[PDB]
Paper text:
Cyclophilins are peptidyl-prolyl isomerases (PPIases: EC 5.2.1.8) and are characterized by their ability to catalyze the interconversion of cis and trans isomers of proline. In order to understand the molecular basis of these results, we sought structural coverage of the entire human cyclophilin enzymatic class. We determined crystal structures of seven human PPIase domains—PPIC, PPIE, PPIG, PPWD1, PPIL2, NKTR, and SDCCAG-10. All cyclophilins share a common fold architecture consisting of eight antiparallel β sheets and two α-helices that pack against the sheets. The active site of the cyclophilin family includes the invariant catalytic arginine (Arg55) and a highly conserved mixture of hydrophobic, aromatic, and polar residues including Phe60, Met61, Gln63, Ala101, Phe113, Trp121, Leu122, and His126.
However, data were collected for the remaining 13 isoforms, and binding to CsA, CsC, or CsD was noted for six isoforms published previously (PPIA, PPIB, PPIC, PPIE, PPIL1, and PPWD1). Additionally, the NMR-based assay does not require substrates to contain chemical modifications, and can be used to measure effects of amino acid substitutions at regions distal to the target proline not measurable by other methods. We detected binding and turnover for at least one of the tetrapeptide substrates tested for PPIA, PPIB, PPIC, PPID, PPIE, PPIF, PPIG, PPIH, PPIL1, PPWD1, and NKTR. Four hundred test peptides of the general form Xaa-Zaa-Gly-Pro (corresponding to substrate positions P3-P2-P1-P1′) were docked into a subset of cyclophilin family members (PPIA, PPIL2, PPIC, PPWD1, and NKTR). These proteins were chosen because of the diversity of the amino acids in the gatekeeper and S2 pocket regions. Much like PPIA, the PPIase domains of PPIC and PPIL2 showed an energetic preference for tryptophan at the P2 position; and for PPIL2 and NKTR isoleucine, leucine, valine, proline, alanine, glycine, cysteine, threonine, and serine at the P2 position resulted in poor predicted binding energies and little penetration into the S2 pocket. PPIC showed a distinct preference pattern for aromatic residues at P2 preceded by basic or aromatic residues at P3. This is most likely due to the substitution of gatekeeper 2 and the overall acidic character of this region of PPIC relative to PPIA. For instance, PPIA and PPWD1 seem to have restricted sets of sidechains that are preferred at the P2 position (and the P3 position in the case of PPIA), while PPIC appears to be more promiscuous.
Author numbering:
A (entry chain A): 32 to 212
B (entry chain I): 1 to 11
The structure:
């Protein structure tokens, strides 16, 4: 057993001028409903702002790729659908391995729009970052971003852009098995 | 270090 994927979000990615494919993230709505709602709403852009047009501004091989700065765009910005920030919902899910999706923050209770996809098992972040999703398709796209040349700020030299985002309804929820759940 | 922050990016 494990928690159920109840929704999905897609990001179509372009690196410079090349379309590199689509990342599909499955979301654990029953585990972290409030966090999932924020991420889905930002993906669809229904509130009038969202992930479309944002980039993965910080990429560190074998650690994570980070994105979702939907205001300033340099990695210092972002906002949630609930306000500037919202509290940490819970820490039920861990960064179990590669491809788990989690909220970036600026300390306790400062979730906004920015998120990251793991490229390792960062156990030191367990209990500090809210985990809410899992990459179910497009791990090759994540790897393409991961291998991008970056500067000394870990920013890709060429922009890795989310050119479209949205949701895909899940008609049949499915379990992502988790050891010892 | 290896953190994921929004504003002050640290070691
Ligand atoms: Ca490696
Ligand atoms: Zn490879």
């Amino acid at each position: 057993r494990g928690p159920s994927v109840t929704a999905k979000v897609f990001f179509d990615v372009r690196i410079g001028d090349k379309d590199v494919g689509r990342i599909v993230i499955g979301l654990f709505g029953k585990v972290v409903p409030k966090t999932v709602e924020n991420f889905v709403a930002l993906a669809t852009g229904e509130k009038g702002y969202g992930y479309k047009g944002s980039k993965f501004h910080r990429v560190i091989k074998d650690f994570m790729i980070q994105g979702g700065d939907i205001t300033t765009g340099d990695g210092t910005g972002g906002v949630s659908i609930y306000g500037e920030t919202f509290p940490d919902e819970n820490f039920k899910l861990k960064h179990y391995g590669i491809g788990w999706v989690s909220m970036a923050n600026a300390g306790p209770d400062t979730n906004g729009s920015q998120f990251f996809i793991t490229l390792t098992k960062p156990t030191w972040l367990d209990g500090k970052h809210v985990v809410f999703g899992k990459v179910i398709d497009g791990m090759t796209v994540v790897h393409s971003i991961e291998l991008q040349a970056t500067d000394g700020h870990d920013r890709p030299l060429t922009n890795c852009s989310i050119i479209n985002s949205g949701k895909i309804d899940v008609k049949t929820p499915f379990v992502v098995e988790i050891a010892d759940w | 270090x290896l953190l994921v922050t929004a504003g002050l990016v640290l070691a």
